[PDB]
Amino acid sequence: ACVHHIKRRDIVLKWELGEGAFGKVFLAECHNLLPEQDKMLVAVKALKEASESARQDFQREAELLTMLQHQHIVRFFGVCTEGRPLLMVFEYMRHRDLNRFLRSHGPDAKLLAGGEDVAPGPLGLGQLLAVASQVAAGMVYLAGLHFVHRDLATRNCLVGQGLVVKIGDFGMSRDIYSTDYYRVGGRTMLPIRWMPPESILYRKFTTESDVWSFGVVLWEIFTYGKQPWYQLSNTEAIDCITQGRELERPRACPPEVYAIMRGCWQREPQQRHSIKDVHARLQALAQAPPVYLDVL
Ligand SMILES: Cc1c2cc(cc1C(=O)Nc1cc(CN3CCN(C)CC3)cc(C3CC3)c1)OCCCCCCCNC(=O)c1ccc3ncc(n3n1)C#C2
Numbered sequence: 001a002c003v004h005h006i007k008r009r010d011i012v013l014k015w016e017l018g019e020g021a022f023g024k025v026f027l028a029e030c031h032n033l034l035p036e037q038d039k040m041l042v043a044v045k046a047l048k049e050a051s052e053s054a055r056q057d058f059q060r061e062a063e064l065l066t067m068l069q070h071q072h073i074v075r076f077f078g079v080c081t082e083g084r085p086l087l088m089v090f091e092y093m094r095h096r097d098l099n100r101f102l103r104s105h106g107p108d109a110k111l112l113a114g115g116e117d118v119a120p121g122p123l124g125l126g127q128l129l130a131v132a133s134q135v136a137a138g139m140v141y142l143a144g145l146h147f148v149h150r151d152l153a154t155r156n157c158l159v160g161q162g163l164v165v166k167i168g169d170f171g172m173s174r175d176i177y178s179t180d181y182y183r184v185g186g187r188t189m190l191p192i193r194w195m196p197p198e199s200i201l202y203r204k205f206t207t208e209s210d211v212w213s214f215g216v217v218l219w220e221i222f223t224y225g226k227q228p229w230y231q232l233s234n235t236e237a238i239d240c241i242t243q244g245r246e247l248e249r250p251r252a253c254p255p256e257v258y259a260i261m262r263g264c265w266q267r268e269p270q271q272r273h274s275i276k277d278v279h280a281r282l283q284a285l286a287q288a289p290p291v292y293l294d295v296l
Pocket of ligand 1: 017018019020021022023024025043045061064065068073074090091092093094096149158167168169170171174
């Protein structure tokens with residue numbers, strides 16, 4: 001109802017960028033979208049099924065995405081519901097999702113990994129903190145709106161040119177991340193490795209469970225995208241989480257940044273730091289002078 005609409009003629013599909021079980025994303029030109037840019041590139045999502053349910057979920061995602069538009073939430077330009085197929089039009093983010101980006105600039109990266117956008121070699125402390133800070137700011141906004149994400153992970157963040165990082169949600173049906181979910185029969189899937197004890201045990205998801213998940217995202221960032229509890233099966237991960245075991249400090253993570261993770265991982269939800277306090281801490285370190293960060 002409140003969604004911006006884009007005329008079908010104004011969208012010109014170029015080629016497929018990627019897909020999940022239920023959706024495909026295309027690169028496209030979109031014209032008369034932004035005035036200063038007669039023709040810009042966008043990412044266009046189309047459904048891979050019809051009849052009723054997914055079309056409801058389409059307009060659900062649309063109204064939600066419009067409501068949640070903010071500087072570090074994925075940018076949504078609107079819909080094309082003029083006939084079929086139904087299309088959702090997103091800002092194009094060249095470096096794709098944050099987990100891919102992290103893995104392609106990890107401990108073994110060298111000169112080749114550098115580009116117009118990012119330095120060669122492994123992402124430096126300054127850059128890792130800048131990424132962490134942007135994700136935290138997005139979570140601050142969502143906590144402000146009392147939106148509970150429930151699947152916060154680097155795989156669900158996008159990275160654009162300039163290394164602008166924004167929080168999205170691709171659902172749980174990309175083959176490449178099937179391993180990041182524990183499938184409970186037909187119920188269906190849970191990102192247990194990112195979930196706090198009270199979510200695993202009591203099936204409660206709150207703003208405080210999101211702070212825990214952000215703690216795990218912070219860990220992902222400083223391990224350059226490796227899966228949490230990678231050494232464990234799903235049931236062994238559930239055992240470890242519920243019994244209070246904690247992810248170890250990443251090699252690239254200074255003790256002070258680890259203190260922030262652990263503050264997200266307080267067993268009792270009310271004892272966890274607020275996301276706004278986490279963001280404040282991370283932004284300070286992100287913006288701190290090289291002289292300070294070099295001995296951090
Ligand atoms: C950006 C994006 C693209 C493609 C998508 C989805 C999204 C997205 O974030 N949507 C989204 C939805 C909600 C609602 N939410 C709540 C309840 N949930 C249970 C469900 C849904 C909330 C939020 C904000 C967190 C508040 C964001 O759908 C397609 C998924 C299929 C796999 C993706 C194909 C691989 N992607 C690419 O190949 C690619 C490459 C470049 C690029 N630039 C922009 C995009 N993009 N994509 C996009 C998108």
